[PDB]
Amino acid sequence: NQIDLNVTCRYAGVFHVEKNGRYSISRTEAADLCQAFNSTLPTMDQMKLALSKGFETCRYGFIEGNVVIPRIHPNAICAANHTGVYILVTSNTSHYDTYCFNASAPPEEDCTSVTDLPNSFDGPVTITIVNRDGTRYSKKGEYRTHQEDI
Ligand SMILES: CC(=O)Nc1ccccc1O
């Protein structure tokens, strides 16, 4: 009973979380997941500030109200070569990665690793935070509050 959460640098508190190496998070799960990091789904303004500090990914993820990809450098296979906060307009499907926002993080680029999941609750899952540098933090718990996400 294991969940891997690949996390990134935080940029103005915003970071990306990919679950189990595939697009697999629902919007309800995403809010609960960010809450386990003492975080919330970023607003579009929080995400735009994170973008301005150096944040970009090549994955769709929830923010408050939309599913987006922050892009700095045009890349043909990432958000169709767009720059800025690219908003997904048309999709059949509901599961993506998520972005999270931690107001207590540093104001600009924080590329230290994540070494805790401070607000997860008691549960049976071995949850492993995987950093981009491969360092890991694991803890037994749960973060999902909606049965349909389990
Ligand atoms: C203060 C701070 O940097 N908190 C935080 C941010 C992202 C993931 C886990 C964390 O504990």
Curated annotation (Swiss-Prot):
Please give the residues the UniProt entry marks as glycosylated: 6, 38, 81, 92, 102
- What's noted about post-translational modification? N-glycosylated. O-glycosylated; contains chondroitin sulfate glycans which can be more or less sulfated.
Which ranges carry the Link domain?
13-102
What does the entry state regarding organ or tissue expression? Answer: Expressed in the intestinal epithelium.
Which positions are annotated as binding hyaluronan? 22, 59-60, 86
Provide the protein's localization.
Cell membrane; Cell projection, Microvillus; Secreted
The disulfide bonds in this chain are: 9-111, 34-100, 58-78
This protein's assembly is summarised as: Interacts with PKN2. Interacts with TIAM1 and TIAM2. Interacts with HA, as well as other glycosaminoglycans, collagen, laminin, and fibronectin via its N-terminal segment. Interacts with UNC119. Interacts with PDPN (via extracellular domain); this interaction is required for PDPN-mediated directional migration and regulation of lamellipodia extension/stabilization during cell spreading and migration. Interacts with RDX, EZR and MSN (via FERM domain). Interacts with EGFR. Interacts with CD74; this complex is essential for the MIF-induced signaling cascade that results in B cell survival.
**Function according to Swiss-Prot or TrEMBL:** Cell-surface receptor that plays a role in cell-cell interactions, cell adhesion and migration, helping them to sense and respond to changes in the tissue microenvironment. Participates thereby in a wide variety of cellular functions including the activation, recirculation and homing of T-lymphocytes, hematopoiesis, inflammation and response to bacterial infection.
Q: What's said on domains?
A: The lectin-like LINK domain is responsible for hyaluronan binding.
Under what name is this protein listed? CD44 antigen
Gene that produces this protein: Cd44
Coverage of the whole protein, first to last residue?
A: 23 to 171 of 778
